[PDB]
Amino acid sequence: DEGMWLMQQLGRKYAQMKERGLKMKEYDLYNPNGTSLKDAVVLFDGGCTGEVVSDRGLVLTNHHCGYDMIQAHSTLEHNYLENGFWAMREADELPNKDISVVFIDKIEDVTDYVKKELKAIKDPNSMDYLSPKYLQKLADKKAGKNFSAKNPGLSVEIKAFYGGNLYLMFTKKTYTDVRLVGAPPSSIGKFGADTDNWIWPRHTGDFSIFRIYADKNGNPAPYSEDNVPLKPKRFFNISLGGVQENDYAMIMGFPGTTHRYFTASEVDEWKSIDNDIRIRMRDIRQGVMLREMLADPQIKIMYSAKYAASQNAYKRAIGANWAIKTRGLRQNKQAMQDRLIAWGAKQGTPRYEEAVHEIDATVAKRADLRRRYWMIEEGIIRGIEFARSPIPTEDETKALQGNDASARKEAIDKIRTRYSKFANKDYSAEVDKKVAVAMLTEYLKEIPYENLPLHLRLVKDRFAGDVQAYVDDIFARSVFGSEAQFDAFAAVPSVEKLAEDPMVLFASSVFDEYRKLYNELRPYDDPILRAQRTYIAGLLEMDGDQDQFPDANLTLRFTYGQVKGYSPRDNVYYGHQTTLDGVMEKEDPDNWEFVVDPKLKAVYERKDFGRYADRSGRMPVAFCATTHTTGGNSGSPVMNANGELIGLNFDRNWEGVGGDIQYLADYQRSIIVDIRYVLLVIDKVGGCQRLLDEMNIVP
Ligand SMILES: NCCNc1ccc([N+](=O)[O-])cc1C(=O)O
């Protein structure tokens, strides 16, 4: 069901949840004045969610959340990323360079306080109401001087909600000694890594295991050999009960952003500029990269990761535009604003209508600037690697005309450093030139001559429209065209060379027009932000916060629904639950994506599933729910009707991407790894029996 609900909204929502099959007492889920399941939830490493699953501070999150730390402890001798990692005692658990988990100790509604401070600001157009500086000073004030010093490990933050109509103060408890305890092999942790990304059905055991270490008193402490595991206020019990179709599921985690209060004009702008330009341009870039990856096995190695990375937001935009096209997103925003305009006329205030009008007019006015911005960002800044070639810094240009000879050698040393980072092991000028020709051709078609970055004018003025010739010249003549050409430059460096270098001119020309469009576009954000405060204020006053959740802003939220499959298209039905048999069907030992660990293979053939199989003796892998999630919900605990852990959220299907603007009851699903599979892989792949023994595993 719809919504990423504030903890303080539990009471307003309990009735709907109780009806969807929730059985816990309210204050056992969230209690502002006592221990609750909320205290088992962490923000893991500043982005992901995790959860505490033992009285000895064991933490579950996704494999993709623990990836960097599993890789940091990976050498070619002991490759943990490949084979997994299973510390057989506490002492073998590996500490991590720059890690955190953050508990949400306390949450207070500080609206009346913040609105009261706000009246001491003269300028009625002040953007301080959404400013991290000002909200943080309002937090320090309300907490005390030397609060971080008085209560060590604790910190405070105020955040805006509902476009500045509601403020919450968070007291955060931060632990910094978080050790790697367990990881499955990446074959399991990343099964179908790229193919099955945003895909249901899904067969990935996307989980890793860490432990929170603290001082003797369980107070936060940086890494010390003398740190001992944290005894936490609360951990999740693990259910073996399983799930069945229409079972109550609920989630707690840290969803990043939503756009629930977009006007119709904003959905049109999202479609017609942001999404259509990203689709057009990444299609061209992806087409040229693919062709060259197929042609040469070395280019494939060099360009595989850059290809995958472009693909990520490419698929998201396709998913997004599909929803605009088919799920009536534009219509439903138009309806919401028309209901409020109508209610506003009768209430005798035009403020709401004046607010929607301000947004519409602002969107219409910025359309050219924004089209140009996206064209240059998708087309050139992301499109063409040689846009990110070295610009001699103001200091560097100076120190080449410098009397002092020590300071020219040092300027050329860090221009060499920056050239080496640009023309790395994975850079091909031949590939970049072909991408650049195709991307620039499309760019020159859409952007008229008078709006071009100054250097791109030369295609028309010097090269008679020949994009190929323009690009060939950039590499022929530039000190960054080849190692040899840079080596010739570095031995006899004049600034008169750099100043006129066609690649430095292209790169600086392009970042100039990028910056300039950013600067002319910035002023248009404020009037929308301010009208949005009024718009949401009206929406709340009209209908209440009951069926109108606050956009996600990287804050702790709960979502609820049922375990339920869906129909993606005519005569096709995806069920609520994948099984290990899905693993075997997709196996292909000659595709890294779909390698099956032999230890799991055997577990399958033996039917060695202990208390973890579904009562038909099938082995669950993943399940999906009508819960409302977005990025930030990676690693989020999935609870049954009694608050027992049944799974671990790890993705969302592509048909639900537009759920960030409008919840999609019959398409959008959270993709969840079954806790029974997690237990299976720990037991039968890792042999890490002490982890089962420290958990409170319930029937
Ligand atoms: N699979 C890469 C991680 N991305 C996500 C993880 C979780 C969720 N979620 O709805 O909870 C969404 C995404 C995402 O890519 O949008």
Residue numbers in the entry: 22 to 720
Structure paper excerpt:
PgDPP11 exhibits a strict substrate specificity for acidic residues (Asp/Glu) at the P1 position (NH2-P2-P1-P1’-P2’-…, where the P1-P1’ bond is the scissile bond), whereas PgDPP7 exhibits a broad substrate specificity for both aliphatic and aromatic residues at the P1 position. PgDPP11 is a homodimer, and each subunit contains a peptidase domain, including a double β-barrel fold that is characteristic of the chymotrypsin superfamily, as well as an unusual α-helical domain that regulates the exopeptidase activity of PgDPP11. Biochemical studies and crystal structure analyses revealed that Arg673 in the S1 subsite of PgDPP11 is a crucial residue for the strict Asp/Glu P1 specificity of PgDPP1123,27,31.
The screening resulted in the first nonpeptidyl inhibitor of S46 peptidases, SH-5 (2-[(2-aminoethyl)amino]-5-nitrobenzoic acid, C9H11N3O4). The binding mode of SH-5 was confirmed by crystal structure analysis at a 2.39 Å resolution. The crystal structure of PgDPP11 complexed with SH-5 (yellow) showed that the carboxy group of SH-5 forms an electrostatic interaction with the side chain of Arg673, a crucial residue for the Asp/Glu specificity of PgDPP1123,27,31. This experimental observation is consistent with the previously obtained in silico docking model based on MM-GBSA scoring (light green). The crystal structure of the SH-5 complex also revealed that the 5-nitro group of SH-5 is involved in a hydrogen bond network with the side chains of Thr650 and Asn670. An amino acid sequence comparison of residues in the S1 subsite of typical S46 peptidases shows that Thr650 and Asn670 in PgDPP11 are well conserved among DPP11s but are replaced by hydrophobic residues, namely, Ile and Ala, respectively, in DPP7s. This result indicates that the hydrogen bond network between Thr650 and Asn670 exists specifically in DPP11s (but not in DPP7s), and the nitro group of SH-5 (and its analog) is also important for the selectivity of this type of inhibitor against DPP11s over DPP7s. For the selectivity, the electrostatic interaction between Arg673 and the carboxy group of SH-5 appears to be more dominant than the hydrogen bond network involving Thr650, Asn670 and the nitro group of SH-5, because Arg673 is replaced by Ser667 in SmDPP11. The Ki vales of SH-5 and the lipophilic analog NPPB against PgDPP11 were estimated to be 8.45 and 15.0 μM, respectively. The target selectivity of the inhibitor, that is the inhibitory effects against DPP11s over DPP7s, is explained by a specific hydrogen bond network and an electrostatic interaction between the inhibitor and the active site residues of PgDPP11 that are conserved among DPP11s but not in DPP7s.
